[PDB]
A paper describes a structure:
At Δt1 = 1 µs and Δt1 = 30 µs, difference densities on D1-Q165, YZ and D1-H190 decrease, indicating that they have moved to their original locations. The trajectories of the YZ area at Δt1 = 1 µs and Δt1 = 30 µs correspond to the re-reduction and re-protonation of YZ• to YZ, which completes by Δt1 = 200 µs, consistent with the 55–85-µs half-life of YZ•+ re-reduction by the OEC in the S1–S2 transition. At Δt1 = 30 µs, paired negative and positive difference densities appear on two sides of Ca, indicating that Mn4 and Ca move outwards from the OEC, causing an increase in the Mn4–Ca distance from 3.83 Å at Δt1 = 200 ns to 3.96 Å at Δt1 = 30 µs. The results suggest that Mn4(III) of the OEC donates one electron to YZ• at Δt1 = 1 µs to Δt1 = 200 µs. At Δt1 = 30 μs to 5 ms, disorder of W10 and the concomitant movement of D1-D342 were observed, consistent with the previously solved structure of the S2 state25. At Δt1 = 30–200 μs, a negative difference density arises on W53′, which is located in the cavity surrounded by OEC-O1, D1-E189, D1-E329, D1-H332 and D1-D342, indicating that W53′ becomes further disordered. Movement of D1-D61 towards the OEC is also observed at Δt1 = 30 μs–5 ms.
In conjunction with the oxidation of the OEC, protons are released in a 1:0:1:2 stoichiometry for the S0–S1, S1–S2, S2–S3 and S3–(S4)–S0 transitions, and two water molecules are split to produce a dioxygen in the S3–(S4)–S0 transition, after which the OEC returns to its most reduced S0 state. Here we use pump-probe serial femtosecond crystallography to reveal the structural dynamics of PSII from nanoseconds to milliseconds after illumination with one flash (1F) or two flashes (2F). We identify structural changes associated with electron transfer, proton release and water delivery at various regions, including QA–QB, YZ, the OEC and the O1, O4 and Cl-1 channels.
Author numbering:
A (entry chain C): 23 to 473
B (entry chain A): 11 to 344
C (entry chain E): 4 to 84
D (entry chain V): 1 to 137
E (entry chain D): 11 to 352
F (entry chain F): 12 to 45
Amino acid sequence: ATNRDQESSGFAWWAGNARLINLSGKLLGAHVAHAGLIVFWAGAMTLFELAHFIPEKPMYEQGLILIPHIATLGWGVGPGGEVVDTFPFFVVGVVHLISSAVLGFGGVYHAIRGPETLEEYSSFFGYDWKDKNKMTTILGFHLIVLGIGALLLVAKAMFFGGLYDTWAPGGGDVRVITNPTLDPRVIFGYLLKSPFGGEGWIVSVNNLEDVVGGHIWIGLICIAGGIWHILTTPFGWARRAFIWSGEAYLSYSLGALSMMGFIATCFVWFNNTVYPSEFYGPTGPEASQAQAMTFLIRDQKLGANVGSAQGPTGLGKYLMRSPTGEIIFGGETMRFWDFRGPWLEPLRGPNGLDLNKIKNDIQPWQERRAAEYMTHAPLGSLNSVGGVATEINSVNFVSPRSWLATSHFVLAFFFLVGHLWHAGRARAAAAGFEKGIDRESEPVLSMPSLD
Amino acid sequence: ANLWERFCNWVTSTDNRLYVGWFGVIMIPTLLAATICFVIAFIAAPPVDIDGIREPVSGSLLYGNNIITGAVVPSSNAIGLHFYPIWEAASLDEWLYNGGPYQLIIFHFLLGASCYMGRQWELSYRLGMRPWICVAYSAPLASAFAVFLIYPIGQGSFSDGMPLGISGTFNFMIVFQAEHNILMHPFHQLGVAGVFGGALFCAMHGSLVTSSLIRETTETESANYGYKFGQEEETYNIVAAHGYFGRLIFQYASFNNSRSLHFFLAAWPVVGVWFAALGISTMAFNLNGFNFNHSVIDAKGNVINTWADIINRANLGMEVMHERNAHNFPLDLA
Amino acid sequence: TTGERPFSDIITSVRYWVIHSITIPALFIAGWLFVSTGLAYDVFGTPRPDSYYAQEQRSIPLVTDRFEAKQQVETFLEQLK
Amino acid sequence: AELTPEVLTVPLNSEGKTITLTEKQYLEGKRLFQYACASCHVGGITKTNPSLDLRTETLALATPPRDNIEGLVDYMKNPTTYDGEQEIAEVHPSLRSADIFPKMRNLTEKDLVAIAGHILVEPKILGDKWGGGKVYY
Amino acid sequence: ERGWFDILDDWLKRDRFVFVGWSGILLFPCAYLALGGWLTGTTFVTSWYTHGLASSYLEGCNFLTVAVSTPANSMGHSLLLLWGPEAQGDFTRWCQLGGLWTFIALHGAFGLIGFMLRQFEIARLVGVRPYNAIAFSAPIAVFVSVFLIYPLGQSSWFFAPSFGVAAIFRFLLFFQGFHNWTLNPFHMMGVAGVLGGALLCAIHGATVENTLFQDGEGASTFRAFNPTQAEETYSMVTANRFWSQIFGIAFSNKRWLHFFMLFVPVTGLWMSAIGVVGLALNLRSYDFISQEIRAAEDPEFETFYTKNLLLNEGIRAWMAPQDQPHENFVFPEEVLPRGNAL
Amino acid sequence: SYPIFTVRWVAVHTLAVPTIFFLGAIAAMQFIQR
Ligand code: CLA
Ligand code: CLA
Ligand code: CLA
Ligand code: CLA
Ligand code: CLA
Ligand code: HEC
Ligand SMILES: CC1=C(/C=C/C(C)=C/C=C/C(C)=C/C=C/C=C(C)/C=C/C=C(C)/C=C/C2=C(C)CCCC2(C)C)C(C)(C)CCC1
Ligand SMILES: CC1=C(/C=C/C(C)=C/C=C/C(C)=C/C=C/C=C(C)/C=C/C=C(C)/C=C/C2=C(C)CCCC2(C)C)C(C)(C)CCC1
Ligand SMILES: CC1=C(/C=C/C(C)=C/C=C/C(C)=C/C=C/C=C(C)/C=C/C=C(C)/C=C/C2=C(C)CCCC2(C)C)C(C)(C)CCC1
Ligand SMILES: [Cl-]
């Protein structure tokens, strides 16, 4: 039992996985077995979703989070996002589930059967956390893999059927992307946009040409950086800035994952391009704008002049100006005037919502789309009673956008806590006082008094 | 000894009466900016159109407020989540009308307080301490982020962020109950357990250590003079404390290891407040408390009310009255 | 220690489990039957799903007198046909 | 109180013929109403147009009358405005518009009767709560 | 003299797994009956005849919505003894009339007395100062003021809190709508004591855990402590320098620190109790007269205080008919206060 | 060596005996239909 108790290892059972820090062979097993769990869930959950899926109900009425991801890539859907073929969902699930047994197998072997340390067995697979050259080489391999992964999305988009495009003329459809945006001013201009309202940083990406072109740039950058880090070793300024240890490296990744979880939380809450509302339900801004649209349409049909209807506050009951003059929906949804969506943009003119188009060009499919989104607003209780907190039981609904945003905020928050925990500990362990203050060497006793 | 190294050694010096440090280099200007603006706005700012309907709310003392009713009022609903620094306004008078100060205060404060947390880590490193005091402070810090930043983001407007005032806080809480039924959310319930339990264990630990102080003084003097700052020996008898409290409940419900006792004192309120902060942060995306409205039905189908339905009646009264002029359409979807 | 037998000793002894593999399920089944026979309703005076209201009434049988409260409840119970 | 056959007896048509539903029909009507209709009609109101509710008194004064099984089944095939003057299949779910309202594709004639029966029975149970909105919650 | 009294004293004070004591004769039956009454009532007993509510697992409620509800308002402040003139010895009627509520509240009150006597009794036997009992006066002050004094000032036990999760939430919301209790400075002080106590709990626990002396070689620092050691297990000197430089001030006296941790939450609970005594008489902090005079005359004057009263007005009108069924409130739709659209 | 019937024995069973009976009662309730 090498390092398998508290006396030999110094770590109690509740920190038991810390006993693996310098046992690269068992550590490899732990990571591979764990990836099997990830792949297992992906395969099993997809099959569960498919078994429970009724093609005549919108996905977002059915508690689906994985099938919407598959459908967005262009598999199984046609015009308007209608499901034409559920077999791709079946394949994706089966293949992930079968692969998890391979990964589970290798994970269990390395964890309990294979060599505990890899350094004696292979200098290629062996590593020392302090070997800055080896660590950047391992990092370089994984950047190349990630870069290839980004290019697979480009290949799907350009050569293997395309992607679902919520903005496609005619109500949304799978479309092959023939001219991805390559202009670096566009691609990197997204990175310098303010993250506040009306700008939205990278969350504002609103067309597939930018999405595909960005992944071309990311693929190349990752492949180049992966080669760079195979061939180089950290420079002197870098060497002096960091802590070089297993726990330190873990803490940096925890910081990175936390940041990414917060970004994903906002992506799914605001973006309706790579999270099409056909599959995920309307965004919060979207459903709120759709209510104003619904009642503008109802009241205009009854003979109201909605352009000149003064509401109780003095602002337009249906229409008003944004702080920069654009014509926008009134009521409390004035806050959401930055919303853009395929069902709304035909009413937009250079000055914002166009009154002539409102009076003359509203099509029945827009009325349908706005009434559907208004009644699937992402509001609901923890037991999945749809609607405002004061609604009665009847509708079993919570938007996928709420499930995905809340879950990833919670996860991103705890990963930020994990970063602080492990970064603070890595610093203390490197300097040598993570177990407490040396009584005979207490630093404060050598310092001058404050007063 | 060049000038940059001198400056670096002063910044990180453990001899300054107040530690500066690299986090303090961001902390000090941002906290000063937020404090100065807050004090001036609280005393003298004119009314603010919080809900974007040209209906300004008076928050400052000079405009008819006392300490209890006063606030710095959140920025206009017409602005939503847009960035509104002073230089985006046509004049200071415009900026004040639209609640510019609220944005300046909370952004500087959230930066400053995040750096306050880094500064706690930083000084512990300079003194040879263990690093995790800043992890405990992350619980109140996360709570501040929840009511000033995360909740506005999910609802689409800083006008639904918490006001900077006493009665403004109450307004925020009441409307939150109406729109999310937070009392019925298990994360707020875990938060109540966090702070009720934290107050319980605070009085517990304080009373047990106080109960077992070793006699070192006469009755005419404060027992506090029986402890001397820096003394090597413990000042109370933890065995007698454990012997009392073990008999109060039973032996194995009591701590005799001071280290794990104090770890428990840290963990219980910090974990509970994390859950409270996560409650606010997930109700920001409208995943609301349990809804049992009309959950109990008789044989014919009559609704049988429960206490949940009585709560709903109260929430309805809050819902229909809040922001009484701000809604033109039947559903308050944000 | 206070002299009683350690709990860990007791609950890993075969004799403990010989006794409690009977006494635990027996209590559970008694609780089940207390409900399934309907006896719980009658002991505590709790309405069945069909006895909250009369067939056409929608008013609560609320108690409104202090010292005739017992008779008021009995009168409400008669009126269930 | 109990779900009795009296409760489950509703008008079949305008001429005064009644029909008595089974408990299974009523419960099936509730489930299907939740499936296809409650997103806008929860509780008997109409979220996208609150002027029109599903109270029997409101259905009686529609044109043609909708306070009976045949009127309600016809409405789910070919809905009209309240005065009968216009056909609104293009914006209201119906069998005629099952291509654009896909949840209507798997409703059968027997389902329409069960949904209709639920709409006519619920007010007899809930009184003012049906179509009354939040005031009666 | 070794008579029967002294022999009984011997047996009561034996060092056993569960200490008993003289206090145990009061404590154990009353605690057990209060808890058993709450479990019995939330499992089996209705609130149909007193409140018009289902309130038991038997009726379909869950852990959040079960309660032992208060008696009907028409019982007044009756003790509701099982053998009293209302239930007249009828156990089923007693349950239907709310007898379990006074049963739980009264056995609970005497149980709490017994627990505090237990703290005194064990402290005297072990030889410690009785500060744990003194601190326990604060939960007692809360229980007595909220569950006894408050309804005794009101019309009946009906308006006391009912014993359940969601029932207590209704009690919070009633106190906002009717009493404007968030505005009350005695509540504010209680909030300060509870939140300040939670703060002190977290900060002291974390400070100790991050100024520990290295008294062992393991990465788990819990093992490096012995209950009988004479040395402090953490550095008061280093902790004092840390907080002085982070926060400006720090504790330097460990005895003061721990008395303060007793003082803060105990004082806060006591202040909140005083305010609830006022609410027994409706002696509220409801309004600021200066605000009302201005706002009555100046329809452009609006504050967060006036915004909150409109919320209170909504709470009262929309919840009163269901929450006070004995009053028979009929509020037609047209009298209900509402904003635009909602 | 050890006794069987002690004060601790009584305290354990005054709690444990009703608990099991109640768990069975509440389990039965999950199959009640209106
Ligand atoms: C993803 C979660 C995960 C993974 C992959 C690991 C992995 C590991 N842990 Mg860790 N651990 C975890 C969570 C995890 N742990 C949790 C939650 C705790 C708290 C309880 C711990 C506490 C802990 C302690 C205290 C210790 C470890 C140790 C270990 C290592 C050796 C385990 C061993 O020797 O068991 C031997 C056990 C068996 C032989 C019994 C069965 C084990 C197999 C693998 C079950 C697999 C079943 C599966 C269905 C089979 C699929 C086969 C199919 C694919 C063909 C191993 C790499 C040890 C270590 O570090 O050694 C140096 C160690 O001392 N862990
Ligand atoms: C990729 C992420 C990652 C990895 C590889 C590690 C790895 C490690 N952590 Mg770190 N940690 C992380 C993220 C991570 N952590 C995060 C996000 C947090 C914030 C919560 C922490 C907070 C943390 C603390 C406070 C400590 C560690 C410690 C450790 C070391 C021992 C871990 C162990 O054996 O736990 C054993 C696992 C358990 C005891 C099981 C925990 C059970 C969890 C709480 C259940 C969660 C509930 C679940 C999500 C849902 C409910 C399930 C239920 C219904 C069945 C090991 C190096 C220890 C250390 O410092 O060693 C150096 C240590 O003291 N971690
Ligand atoms: C990314 C994470 C994620 C998200 C967003 C969803 C979302 C959803 N799931 Mg999926 N699922 C997940 C992971 C996720 N799931 C995992 C890990 C499993 C395997 C257990 C499943 C297995 C699963 C099944 C079998 C089903 C769903 C269903 C659903 C839908 C309804 C959810 C519901 O009612 O929850 C109820 C809410 C809860 C149970 C709340 C959990 C509270 C946790 C325990 C708190 C944890 C906090 C934190 C992690 C711990 C910190 C500890 C601290 C000390 C550090 C919803 C779309 C349902 C569906 O509709 O399918 C179509 C359904 O039947 N999911
Ligand atoms: C990233 C995960 C990973 C890593 C770094 C290793 C590394 C190692 N393995 Mg382990 N192992 C793994 C996963 C991994 N394995 C998996 C998934 C399984 C189940 C198939 C195993 C089962 C296994 C056994 C039975 C043995 C090892 C052995 C070894 C050692 C020698 C391997 C060698 O020289 O092959 C040379 C390289 C090749 C033969 C090339 C393989 C190319 C693969 C099969 C094709 C796919 C490549 C492509 C990138 C895959 C993408 C997958 C992705 C989509 C998930 C080395 C330390 C040996 C050992 O421990 O000696 C004592 C040994 O006997 N492994
Ligand atoms: C997982 C991805 C990854 C990781 C972990 C690393 C890690 C490393 N890189 Mg490598 N690198 C990568 C990918 C990665 N790289 C890729 C894809 C490329 C190709 C573009 C490179 C090209 C590269 C070069 C040319 C160099 C490195 C170097 C390094 C080392 C120093 C890093 C450092 O100081 O950052 C700290 C970050 C900075 C100092 C940036 C400036 C600080 C700004 C102000 C922070 C702004 C933060 C703000 C919140 C940004 C938000 C988003 C923003 C875009 C708006 C470190 C080992 C250095 C090295 O030593 O090489 C041997 C080095 O010279 N990398
Ligand atoms: C929102 C997208 C709706 C869905 C889903 C359903 N209904 Fe509906 N209904 C809706 C509106 C906007 C209206 C008014 C139409 C008009 O302009 O007149 C209606 C009306 C009805 C009526 C008539 C009610 C009356 O005349 O008093 C009935 C009987 C009705 N709707 C029934 C109904 C059924 C059975 C549904 C599920 C199959 C259904 N509706 C769904 C909006 C929406
Ligand atoms: C190390 C360790 C650990 C861990 C472990 C793990 C984590 C493992 C994993 C594992 C895994 C990860 C596994 C997996 C497996 C899998 C499988 C075995 C699968 C199979 C499949 C199948 C058989 C399928 C089938 C089918 C088809 C094909 C079709 C459809 C239908 C069905 C589904 C039927 C623990 C913590 C315990 C502790 C100790 C140590
Ligand atoms: C895909 C895509 C795209 C693109 C993208 C991109 C292009 C990205 C990039 C990105 C990037 C490019 C990023 C970056 C990042 C960075 C970071 C995040 C950094 C950090 C840093 C740090 C953390 C540092 C720290 C420090 C300091 C500061 C001092 C000294 C010490 C240390 C080092 C610690 C778009 C949008 C178009 C569209 C969609 C899709
Ligand atoms: C009132 C009265 C009385 C009494 C009675 C009694 C005394 C009773 C008791 C009773 C009891 C004594 C009961 C109990 C019950 C119990 C239960 C019912 C429990 C349950 C539990 C559970 C359900 C759990 C859960 C959980 C938690 C909580 C956490 C952890 C995990 C778990 C999940 C497990 C007399 C006769 C004198 C007289 C008349 C009146
Ligand atoms: Cl509105």
